[PDB]
UniProtKB/Swiss-Prot annotation:
The keyword Secreted applies. It holds the Pfam family DUF3298. The lineage of its organism: Bacteria, Bacillati, Actinomycetota, Actinomycetes, Mycobacteriales. The keyword Signal applies. It comes from Mycobacterium tuberculosis (strain ATCC 25618 / H37Rv). Belongs to the RsiV family. Transmembrane segments: none annotated. Keywords: Secreted, Signal. This is Immunogenic protein MPT64. One of its GO terms (molecular function) is zymogen binding. GO terms for cellular component: extracellular region; peptidoglycan-based cell wall. It is found in: Secreted. Gene3D superfamilies: Fervidobacterium nodosum Rt17-B1 like (3.30.565.40), Heat-shock cognate protein, ATPase (3.90.640.20). GO terms for biological process: cellular response to starvation.
Amino acid sequence: PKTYCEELKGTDTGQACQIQMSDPAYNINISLPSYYPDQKSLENYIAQTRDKFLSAATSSTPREAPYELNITSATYQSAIPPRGTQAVVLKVYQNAGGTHPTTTYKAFDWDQAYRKPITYDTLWQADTDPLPVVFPIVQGELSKQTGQQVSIAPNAGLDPVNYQNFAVTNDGVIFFFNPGELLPEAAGPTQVLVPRSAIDSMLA
């Protein structure tokens, strides 16, 4: 019931897998729920994520004192005749030394039926169009709320800021970016949901 994190210097907290280690000028605390297929994706990514953030503070960032990475993901799953798909969105925000403001939440899509994640080869399709697909309920409930559906701004609400990252479920693929008011630069990244039957075949 583990992945990288286990050997990644892992610490146990229960329904989490944690890697907390800090160097003489920075810090890393990162968590993975028991089973995230190829978390190797984030945690390979952290090698990538945090190095990039510390990567800048290796020169001149308001580093509180040294540097740190807080990161942790949640998985989701698609529903297709045989199983479906899996995507896990990490809470990873880090700052150089406390003070360099740096935040992002990252999720990824992996194939559920074949135990296989997808890459930019066929993960990005540049057949890329709007992502209001989560938005329907938000207004749809609104439609409950005022008996009608309104206008919600995408960085004002395209997608649940309750999410935070590329979270593709059987209902869609919610993609996140960090803007100003769908969870500002302080709350993390915004997100826009892409068509489930539409964008997957529209992957790559």
